[PDB]
Amino acid sequence: ITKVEAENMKIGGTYAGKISAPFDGVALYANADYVSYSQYFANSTHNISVRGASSNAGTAKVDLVIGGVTVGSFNFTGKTPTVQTLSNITHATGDQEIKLALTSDDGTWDAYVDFIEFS
Ligand SMILES: [Ca+2]
Ligand SMILES: [Ca+2]
């Protein structure tokens, strides 16, 4: 397993910033808010998990982008943190940017991101 905390990544966008509740992590508020870091991959295919939460009862959606290509998304509904998992995602090998980004914000929720895990 490879686990990287959101709070240790590059944080970007107009509003993105760290939070301490409901976990140590990062809040994404508006479209183009993101966290990213560079990951070396020896292998092409991983199960990918992100722990996160919504700011409210709504469903926060976070895109997963690897090497600039969107490979899936994670949905977090409600304020209680959950772990969301994409199974068997194939992506580029070598050094690749990993980004968790908002693209579907509409002023009804914010997304809280705790960590990403590759297995
Ligand atoms: Ca928002
Ligand atoms: Ca964290």
Q: Which residue, among 67, 70, 63, has the nearest Cα to 94 in the 3D structure?
A: 67
Q: Are 114 and 74 in contact (CB under 8 A)?
A: no
SS3 8: helix
Q: Which residues, including other chains, have CB under 8 Å from residue 110's CB and lie 6 or more apart? A: 27, 28, 29, 54, 55, 60
Q: Which residue, among 12, 10, 35, has the nearest Cα to 112 in the 3D structure?
A: 35
Q: Which residue, among 6, 24, 15, 1, has the nearest Cα to 64 in the 3D structure?
A: 6
Q: Is 24 annotated as a binding residue?
A: yes
Q: Is 34 annotated as a binding residue?
A: no
- For residue 88, the CA-to-ligand 1 centroid distance in Å is 30
| CATH number of the domain enclosing 17 | 2.60.120.260
Q: Is 5 annotated as a binding residue?
A: yes
Encoded amino acid at 81, one letter? P
Range of the domain at 91: 1-119
Find residue 68's DSSP bridge partners: none
- For residue 71, the CA-to-ligand 1 centroid distance in Å is 22
SS3 29: coil
Q: What is the resolution of this structure in A?
A: 1.5
Question: For the chain, what is the domain count?
Answer: 1
Other C-beta atoms lying within 10 Å of the C-beta of residue 68: 9
Other C-beta atoms lying within 10 Å of the C-beta of residue 61: 17
- 36 burial (CB, 10 Å; 0-12 / 13-18 / 19+) is middle
